[PDB]
Design an enzyme around this catalytic site. Structure first.
Site, mmCIF file in Angstrom:
data_model
loop_
_atom_site.group_PDB
_atom_site.id
_atom_site.type_symbol
_atom_site.label_atom_id
_atom_site.label_comp_id
_atom_site.label_asym_id
_atom_site.label_seq_id
_atom_site.Cartn_x
_atom_site.Cartn_y
_atom_site.Cartn_z
ATOM 1 C CD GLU A 140 68.565 15.647 45.591
ATOM 2 O OE1 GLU A 140 68.671 15.059 43.789
ATOM 3 O OE2 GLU A 140 69.163 15.158 45.427
ATOM 4 C CG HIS A 141 71.800 21.060 44.083
ATOM 5 N ND1 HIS A 141 73.245 21.604 44.628
ATOM 6 C CD2 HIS A 141 71.386 20.332 43.473
ATOM 7 C CE1 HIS A 141 73.568 20.706 43.543
ATOM 8 N NE2 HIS A 141 72.763 19.719 42.400
ATOM 9 C CD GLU A 199 76.205 18.810 41.759
ATOM 10 O OE1 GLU A 199 75.509 19.369 40.941
ATOM 11 O OE2 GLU A 199 76.531 18.573 42.978
#
Lengths: 49, 106, 57, 418, 51, 446
Positions: free
Chosen positions: F60-61, F137
């Protein structure tokens, strides 16, 4: 991180057939929690002494 | 609610006021009320100057009773100058308790 | 005629009966934490983020 | 369909309704009140008025309002800005005439009893501390105090010395002077037009005209610094621009999207923001830049906003300010003005899409201009902005007197004269 | 009074008379075990407790 | 003047089609100048195993950072120059990518989405740069206390199953995930009997279907690599995790019993029941007068900062319970009053409280469908969960059947003498013992 915290394995302690962690908590609570709780059944009818 | 013999009943109300004797200790009628949970909410809703007047009148009457004495007759509370200062605050506290009670059964 | 919220940047606070207090339009403005190390610190008093406003039923 | 019915009553009230056929309704009352109408003897009255929407009124107690609205699953909320207050009610379509009577009691017949107002004073401290966990809240209140001398300098939140001292007579005086019929707009979204009118003659009996004459806001070019222990430096630098509803205000809106006003891609590197690309040429630490715009009825502010690390704060502000100078001396491509018009048009149609965004858009039009315009009339005004008008707005910023506000570890932050 | 009357008071009494007769019948059969109640001892004759 | 019954019939219908590929195409037309269109996938961390638990969140990144036709930032320049937005998310079961745009740029938006899910480049130098962004993150999410405590609850309720692991994965997986692990993840889970193309706003279904045949029909329309994996269920285990930290200012506690899955009809009376317990926060306006008993008590005695009830569903199992935040001397009175409300609903539940709980649930589901992005997400994940879109008129006939004896029956099945799962984050010395919590599930009188 907190994503590195997983529960250690407890399969040394479980009620024998519930160790099969593939089937899910629906038939394996119909008949799992009671005969040492029938030991609570005789510890009253016998507590009457 | 009679209109012709409400002069007779005005005299019975004066007789009972003097036979009761909180006026001889310098008290008003609302000073002598029994404090339940309803009356305790009306007390904390009073304005500061009326709350302070009530605390001193009660303290002075409790001091006269310790000594078995009363006030001079020129300082007795008169029947027409007794102010019912607590009665409007108490009617509102009671009216709000009836509404929480009709809501809970319906 | 166009609102405060139409051009972005002046503030607005909101208050509820059943939902949470909110502030502003473009305050948590993006590409702030997306280049890294913006920790969000813990409270001694605050509101819940979801605001409940978004649940499917 | 049925685009909007729009009516002005003979004493100023504006009524506007649209009949959808949606299962839910929304009704809002919009008033010209807010923190710009208080003077220095009653600061923080508008913050306490915002928090007092469920106290005892003349037609319902505080128990009946909370229990009656929750019984049908409804909501009640208050939204404020420096120039406006908005009271909003929503429920399902069959219940909306029950919640309309509650909304007219909160705004047209409040009581402010002593013991209820005294128990509410501690909520002012909780609401302010929750909002100030965001560092933008305090920077933007300090920026308005540095930029003005009166009116728009007043904060949205009550000052600390004043918590505990807002009296019931100050609340009675504010509502009596600012909540009148020629300053109000009643907007409905899932109701009919004759039913709102009969609601309107139940508070047409009193509060009949204009209120009082707030003063014009005088501009002050000032500075407010705030040294603290936050980990990043926030800073803002503005100048006076243009009032809402003029031809120069549209040129400042286009200039905001030329420079950059927030991202479009999740975790994207902001490839079409002019400010972001210029700062990133020499700064290789985490940061964020944006253009700031704020328009009001008689004044406006425009400038830049940076977030950086403390040892890099002067490098970021100088690089960002040097990019606006390049635009003001003619360097402005034609394909950049066109891509900025697309972002401004698409953002306007996406913000009117939901029922909350649409009701807000109609209510702010009725207070400021007294009319309703379709979004096709708005989209024409954006396309009539020329390229020379954008260059002229960047010259008004560069030559104008500046205001500034900053917070964090300010040991490397420049002063507004350097 | 009417502070206790309503459709909610005997609401939870109709839910608690099963928790009531069980309040009562257990204490009623609890009163034979204690004081050797001999005219209800052989109510059912299967308890020959007295030798 | 219409009625609430008449307004539910006038809602437009959803049209569903299918390609020979297996891909499903669904839309709802609603007259507007804007639209939302996206792709929903049956992929998630419950389909990963221990060697690749980070992999679906790593992908997804990299999805918005280059394809074969649109290298690098050319995708960013093309989305921004028309005024459009581009977003993604990833749960334990689902993955989405979607676009908000004007209803004139729909041909360009569908072409962009097909390029993202089929032709993502996944180049090595972008992989090493993205590895540092993910490791920062993880440290940012450790300071959010609600996210840590809900990860603890999944790790203890589903201990030895794949539903216990987290979406992001551990830090040692993030440091080791190679390129061949990521290309193998895409070839295995990004297949289209498994994808849904949804759209809402001003959209014609026939134009959306013609654009799907043009851009999506290059996906291979079968299950080759013979991967028909058997869906194996996940057991619930009553248990506990306690993280003691006295330097944090407030404590976080979450409690859950096992709930029903997605397609179980028990789900509708169980959220009439959670709407009777409610939610609370210290910034609410009308405490001590609120209809919820737990909210009226926590406001009068100032017992907590906040609480909320939840109902989280998966395919075969679920979590049902509550979460609260309070100070160190308040935990024991919070657990006492909450468990007393679960027991009062298993018995004693009144008809007047069930009328309020039905009105709350009606309002919550029509207010969640306001705008094109929440409608498009309701289309894209109902077709992966129920196989269809339950219309609003069908939700309203399932709510009208609920009465006080249904609520009294379904709560006894799920709450009454059950072993719960508990997670806590500090300062938690007054969090009551597990024996004392488990004894709070049975009653005194009934």
């Amino acid at each position: 991180s907190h994503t590195d915290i997983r529960v250690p394995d407890f399969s040394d302690y479980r009620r024998a057939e519930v160790l099969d962690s593939t089937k899910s908590s629906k038939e394996s609570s119909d008949a799992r929690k009671g005969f040492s709780y029938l030991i609570t059944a005789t510890t009253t009818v016998g507590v009457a002494y | 609610a009679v209109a012709a013999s409400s002069k007779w009943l005005e005299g019975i109300r004066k007789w009972y006021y003097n036979a009761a004797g909180f006026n001889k200790l310098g008290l008003m009628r609302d000073d002598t009320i029994y404090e339940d949970d309803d009356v305790k909410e009306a007390i904390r809703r009073l304005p500061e100057n009326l709350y302070n007047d009530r605390v001193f009148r009660i303290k002075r009457a409790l001091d006269l009773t310790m000594r078995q004495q009363i006030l001079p007759k020129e300082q007795w509370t008169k029947y027409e100058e007794d102010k019912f200062y607590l009665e409007p605050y108490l009617k509102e506290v009671i009216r709000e308790r009836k509404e929480r009670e009709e809501w809970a059964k319906k | 005629m166009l609102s405060v919220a139409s051009r972005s940047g002046p503030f607005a606070p909101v208050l509820s009966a059943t939902s949470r207090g909110v502030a502003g339009a473009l305050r948590p403005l993006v590409q702030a934490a997306l280049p890294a190390t913006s920790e969000s610190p813990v409270l001694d008093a605050k509101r819940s983020f979801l605001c409940r406003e978004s649940l499917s039923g | 369909p049925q685009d909007l019915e729009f009516t002005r009553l003979p004493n100023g009230l504006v009524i506007a309704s649209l009949e959808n056929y949606a299962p839910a309704s929304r009704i809002g009352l919009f008033i010209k009140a807010g923190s710009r109408y208080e003077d220095s003897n009653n600061l923080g009255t508008s913050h306490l008025l915002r928090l007092a929407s469920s106290l005892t009124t003349k037609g319902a107690s505080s128990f009946k309002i909370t229990r009656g609205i929750e019984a049908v699953g409804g909501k009640l909320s208050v939204t404020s800005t420096r120039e406006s207050m908005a009271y909003t009610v929503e429920c399902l379509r069959d219940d909306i005439e029950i919640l309309m009577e509650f909304l007219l009691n909160v705004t047209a017949a409040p009581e402010f009893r002593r013991w209820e107002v005294a128990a509410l004073q501690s909520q002012l401290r909780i609401d302010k501390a929750v909002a100030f966990q965001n560092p933008q809240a305090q920077v933007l209140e300090n920026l308005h105090a540095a930029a003005y001398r009166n009116a728009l300098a007043n904060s949205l939140y009550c000052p600390d010395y004043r918590i505990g001292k807002v009296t019931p007579d100050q609340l009675h005086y504010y509502v009596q002077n600012h909540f009148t019929s020629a300053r109000m707009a009643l907007i409905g979204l899932g109701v009919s037009h004759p039913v709102l009118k009969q609601v309107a003659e139940r508070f047409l009996n009193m509060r009949g005209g204009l209120g009082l004459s707030g003063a014009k806001a005088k501009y002050r070019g000032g500075e407010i610094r705030d040294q603290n222990g936050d980990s990043l430096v926030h800073a803002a630098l503005v100048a006076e621009s243009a009032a809402t509803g003029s031809a120069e205000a549209n040129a400042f809106s286009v200039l905001q999207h030329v420079l950059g006003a927030g991202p479009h891609v999740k975790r994207g590197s902001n490839a079409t923001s002019s400010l972001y690309q210029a700062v990133a040429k020499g700064v290789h630490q985490p940061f964020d830049v944006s253009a700031f715009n704020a328009s009001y009825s008689d004044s406006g502010l425009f400038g830049i906003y940076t977030i950086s690390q403390a040892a890099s704060a002067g490098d970021v502000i100088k690089s960002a300010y040097d990019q606006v100078k390049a635009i003001a001396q003619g360097n402005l491509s034609n394909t950049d003005v066109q891509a900025a018009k697309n972002k401004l048009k698409a953002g306007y149609l996406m913000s009117v899409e939901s029922s909350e965004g649409f009701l807000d858009e109609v209510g702010s039009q009725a207070l400021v201009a007294g009319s309703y315009m379709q979004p096709s009339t708005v989209l024409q005004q954006i396309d009539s902005v020329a390229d020379a008008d954008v260059i002229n707005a960047a010259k008004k910023f560069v030559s104008g007197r500046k205001s500034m506000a900053a917070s964090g570890n300010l040991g490397h932050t420049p002063f507004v004269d350097e | 009074l009417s502070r206790f009357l309503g459709p909610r008071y005997r609401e939870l009494a109709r839910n608690w008379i099963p928790t009531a007769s069980m309040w009562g019948a257990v204490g009623a059969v609890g009163l034979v075990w204690a004081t050797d109640w001999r005219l209800i001892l052989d109510w059912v004759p299967y308890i020959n407790g007295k030798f | 003047t219409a009625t609430y019954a008449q307004a539910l019939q006038s809602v437009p219908e959803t049209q569903v089609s299918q390609l020979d590929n297996g891909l499903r195409v669904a839309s709802e037309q609603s007259s507007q100048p804007t639209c939302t269109v996206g792709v929903w996938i049956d992929a998630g961390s419950r389909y990963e195993n221990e060697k690749n638990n980070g992999a679906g969140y790593f992908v997804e990144h990299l999805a918005f950072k280059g394809t074969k036709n649109r290298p690098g930032s050319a995708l960013e320049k093309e989305v921004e120059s028309m005024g459009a937005h581009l977003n993604a998310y990833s749960t334990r079961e689902h993955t989405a990518y979607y676009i908000k745009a004007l209803s004139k740029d729909l041909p360009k938006a569908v072409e962009l989405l097909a390029d993202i899910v089929q032709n993502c480049s996944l180049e090595d130098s972008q992989i090493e740069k993205e590895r540092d962004v993910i490791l920062q993150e993880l440290q940012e999410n450790d300071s959010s206390m609600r996210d840590v405590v809900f990860d603890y609850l999944h790790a203890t309720a589903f201990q030895g199953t794949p539903l216990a692991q987290s979406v992001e994965g551990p830090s040692e997986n993030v440091r080791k995930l190679s390129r061949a692990d990521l290309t193998e993840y895409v070839s295995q889970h990004y297949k289209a009997p498994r994808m849904v193309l949804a759209a809402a706003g001003g959209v014609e279904h026939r134009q959306l279907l013609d654009l799907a045949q043009k851009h999506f029909s290059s996906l291979s329309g079968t299950y080759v690599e013979d991967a028909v994996p058997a869906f194996t269920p996940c057991r619930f285990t009553g248990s506990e995790i306690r993280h003691r930290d006295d330097a944090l200012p407030l404590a976080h506690v979450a409690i859950a019993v096992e709930g029903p899955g997605w397609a179980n009809p028990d789900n509708v009376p169980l959220q009439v029941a959670n709407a009777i317990i409610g939610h609370y926060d210290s910034t609410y306006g009308g405490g001590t007068h609120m209809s919820s008993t737990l909210a009226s008590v926590a406001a009068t005695r100032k017992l907590c900062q906040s609480f909320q009830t939840f109902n989280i569903c998966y395919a075969e199992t679920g979590l049902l319970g509550a979460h609260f935040v309070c100070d160190n001397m308040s935990i024991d009175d919070m657990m006492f009053f909450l468990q007393g409300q679960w027991m009062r609903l298993c018995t004693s539940a009144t008809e007047s409280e069930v009328v309020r709980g039905k009105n709350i649930l009606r309002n919550a589901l029509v207010s969640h469908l306001d705008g094109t992005t929440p409608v498009c997400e309701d289309i894209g994940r109902s077709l992966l969960t129920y196989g269809r879109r339950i219309p609003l008129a069908e939700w309203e006939s399932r709510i009208a059947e609920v009465d006080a004896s249904v609520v009294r029956e379904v709560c006894s099945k799920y709450f009454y003498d059950q072993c719960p799962a508990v997670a806590g984050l500090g300062p938690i010395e007054q969090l009551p013992d597990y024996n004392r919590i488990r004894s709070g599930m049975f009653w005194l009188r009934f």
